[PDB]
Amino acid sequence: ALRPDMGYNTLANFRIEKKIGRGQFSEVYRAACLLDGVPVALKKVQIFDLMDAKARADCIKEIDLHKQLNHPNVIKFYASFIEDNELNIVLELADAGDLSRMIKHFKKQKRLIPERTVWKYFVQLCSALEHMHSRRVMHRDIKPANVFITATGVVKLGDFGLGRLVGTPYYMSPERIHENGYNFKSDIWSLGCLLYEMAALQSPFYGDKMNLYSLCKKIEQCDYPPLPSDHYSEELRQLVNMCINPDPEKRPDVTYVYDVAKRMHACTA
Ligand SMILES: CN(C)CCCNS(=O)(=O)c1cccc(Nc2nc(OCC3CCCCC3)c3[nH]cnc3n2)c1
Missing domain, CATH: 1.10.510.10 (Transferase(Phosphotransferase) domain 1)
Incomplete structure (x- = not known):
């Protein structure tokens, strides 16, 4: 549900507002951090599959x-982690x-x-x-x-x-x-x-x-x-x-x- 201990390290602490764009090999979503309210932007690198x-x-x-x-x-760079076999990179939102x-x-x-x-x-x-x-x-x-x-x-x-x-x-x-x-x-x-x-x-x-x-x-x-x-x-x-x-x-x-x-x-x- 929610886990402040990890902080920015688990997708359970964000609410994905909307999908802002699709990158080269990634999809970036807008989000809000529940712990403190800051808006962050996630990056789903999709390294789980098709990568050694x-x-x-x-x-x-x-x-x-x-x-x-x-x-x-x-x-700015906030956090990078692997959750559910998906590399999420949360960065500052412009x-x-x-x-x-x-x-x-x-x-x-x-x-x-x-x-x-x-x-x-x-x-x-x-x-x-x-x-x-x-x-x-x-x-x-x-x-x-x-x-x-x-x-x-x-x-x-x-x-x-x-x-x-x-x-x-x-x-x-x-x-x-x-x-x-x-x-x-x-x-x-x-x-x-x-x-x-x-x-x-x-x-x-x-x-x-x-x-x-x-x-x-x-x-x-x-x-x-x-x-x-x-x-x-x-x-x-x-x-x-x-x-x-x-x-x-x-x-x-x-x-x-x-x-x-x-x-x-x-x-x-
Ligand atoms: C469009 N609206 C109706 C809905 C959203 C209402 N506007 S919004 O929330 O402020 C808004 C909309 C778009 C962009 C941004 N700024 C932004 N976008 C990123 O995505 C990169 C991605 C990968 C490359 C090319 C495609 C996009 C970022 N990644 C890291 N920092 C980023 N900052 C902000």
Whole structure:
């Protein structure tokens, strides 16, 4: 029935209000904690089935890491447990939904995001990434569907990746296109595509045809529809070209990107 002793460690202490969305391989529900009333958001990873013992251990190792990060622009982490053969991850609830919901809303009404608000948000999530990279931690999953906004307007980064019937991680990168491996400069790439979707409300390499080889060819040569010159500063447009660079060596460190956003956030007050 109820068990305060465990605290946030058993699903018996929450009331599932509604299902807010379905993740990559997970379903996230809104909930209320009965013990103290705080609103929390559950994550059903569905690792019970179709997963080996090592992959489960790996999934935990990521959770143990994500719990160590404490930052204003990273979603708070409350509890992770296995109950009834289902890994539930209860995280802080952000009123304004995932960033993709904001993009899909704006796109629905055919109005672009002002440049002054792009920097307002972009600087926040850059702060989170500089925090991680400075501690030798790569996010490995930066997409609009995993960026969250509070009613106040603050932006938060989210959970780590669950990659552990063809699938596309929203922002596929060249290092991973070939058998090279995810690295730090590969997180910038995702960050670059994110800045582009805020401005254009559509992924840069989103195409009319979903062919993997067709899309792969469009990533080798950085060919993508440029942004409206009038509405978005050259400072921004060049920062996108800078991050969406095939060769990882040419991309910038998260700091330089972080410094540009700060400077540009002040300019567009
Ligand atoms: C839609 N309404 C009628 C019903 C709910 C009334 N609004 S609401 O309660 O404040 C509301 C609605 C939607 C989102 C959010 N914010 C939120 N959503 C998450 O789910 C992530 C999931 C996985 C990726 C993409 C799909 C969503 C979070 N996960 C961690 N933190 C999260 N914060 C809040």
